[PDB]
Amino acid sequence: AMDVQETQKGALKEIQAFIRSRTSYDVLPTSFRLIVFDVTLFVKTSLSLLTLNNIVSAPLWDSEANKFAGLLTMADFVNVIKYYYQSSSFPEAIAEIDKFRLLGLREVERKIGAIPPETIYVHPMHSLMDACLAMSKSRARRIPLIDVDGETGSEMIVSVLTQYRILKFISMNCKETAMLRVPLNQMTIGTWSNLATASMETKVYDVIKMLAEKNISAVPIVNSEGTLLNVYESVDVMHLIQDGDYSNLDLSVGEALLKRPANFDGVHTCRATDRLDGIFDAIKHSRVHRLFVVDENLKLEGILSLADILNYIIYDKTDNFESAV
Amino acid sequence: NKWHFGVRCRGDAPEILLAVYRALQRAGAQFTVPKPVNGKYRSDMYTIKSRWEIPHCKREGKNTYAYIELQLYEVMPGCFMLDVKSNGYKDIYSKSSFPFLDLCAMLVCKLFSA
Amino acid sequence: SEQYSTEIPAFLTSNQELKLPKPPSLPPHLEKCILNSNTAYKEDQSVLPNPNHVLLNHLAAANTQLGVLALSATTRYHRKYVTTAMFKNFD
Ligand SMILES: Nc1ncnc2c1ncn2[C@@H]1O[C@H](COP(=O)(O)OP(=O)(O)OP(=O)(O)O)[C@@H](O)[C@H]1O
């Protein structure tokens, strides 16, 4: 625990041992709501329920079986949209996904390879490390916590854990975050080359085929000089298609962006000289979903996503589709 | 348009009680019945205990059951709540809101299509 | 253990001019549903207050303007509480 790198190394071990010692259940509020959708819900209705509840995602319920039937995220739309844009000779064909029940949308995704065979879940009373490792293995950014009622065989969806709520939980509870004082430019962490970026003139469909192919949740928007202006997230796709208007997919990123409500998480940035202590501190007080590494001139240099951070702190060291967003 | 306990009803309480029993019977539930104490009926007639076979269990050969108690309340003259609560699940051989809530949706559809 | 029946009581199936008892009036505790709360939605909008232990696994309901059913119940999961709000078709 001697110099900076040696104090950080130590602190990272304390943080993993802590993740291992807690369960996923430990992360939950004492009392909370869980919004669940029937898999036979129409796609349009489900987007409408997501907007009106200010959520971007919901667990699915096959009520006949009494079984968890998957996780509806924006990756579902991003993947089918991308498939239709790559494979269809007919631009209006995409509209057809409004005929679909959630069951039928998922079957299109199974067919194209956008859904894995083994669907991903952990037990709520198992270690939190299980949740991290599953998310790390799949590239899922949320994971359902499922128990089973032994009297009925019925599956009990307890909650759905997010990378953000796990990092928040750690920031709030592990004092060791304050000892992570190594600058980013002396760590192997984040992505610093071959970045996927867009401009305000970029078509939304080209961004959305960036998100699927690269399997990222967001694309930074830069200008001619490379200065960071904004972001286009997969959650923004929801606002574009919540009304049934799939020709909104043909808009420039600029036009699309002018429709965004003031509800925005925000665009967070840091410098290559910043450290994980300050980052966990921002996580503690703000819904930060990623950090764009910039210079003094707001020039984009890299990306530090939540997955980047989690995957750094949990390891001893030592398809063309978006995963669950 | 906010969340409220139960289902809203109006009109006559014996007419509502009848409609509830008819809905239970269409859904396939089994239920207790009003007994008259000294020939006369008591307001406990508005407390119904129901037993429901669980479809997913029933399909796999199982005698597992869900217990749901219904309670009619007057909110004000003409307006009633049907309160509906889980008493649990039991298999013939020796927690969760499901299948309870999947059964309540069944009841609600029968009440609404009567 | 109860006497379960399959058939509708016959006094209810008669053509009404019978002198019957009234249901109990609504108790104060079934007037407020905790889902109508969102006190702390800046930090975490899923956070609810602790429920009245007597209102565990009572059905709650909401109107939607969407052609679907909204149903919920609160239950204890070990020492925490989950209020699941479910959206479901009629057919
Ligand atoms: N625009 C981009 N171009 C290239 N690589 C990226 C870009 N954005 C993220 N990455 C990298 O690609 C991988 C996928 O990132 P991703 O954004 O999916 O993280 P995440 O799990 O979604 O967490 P967050 O929600 O915070 O982004 C990560 O290792 C990330 O650092």
Ligand SMILES: Nc1ncnc2c1ncn2[C@@H]1O[C@H](COP(=O)(O)OP(=O)(O)O)[C@@H](O)[C@H]1O
């Ligand atoms: N299916 C759901 N049911 C109930 N609440 C949800 C659901 N999805 C999200 N929320 C709530 O919405 C808020 C923002 O959620 P989200 O953006 O999905 O996750 P995070 O904030 O963890 O990245 C959180 O308070 C979360 O608990």
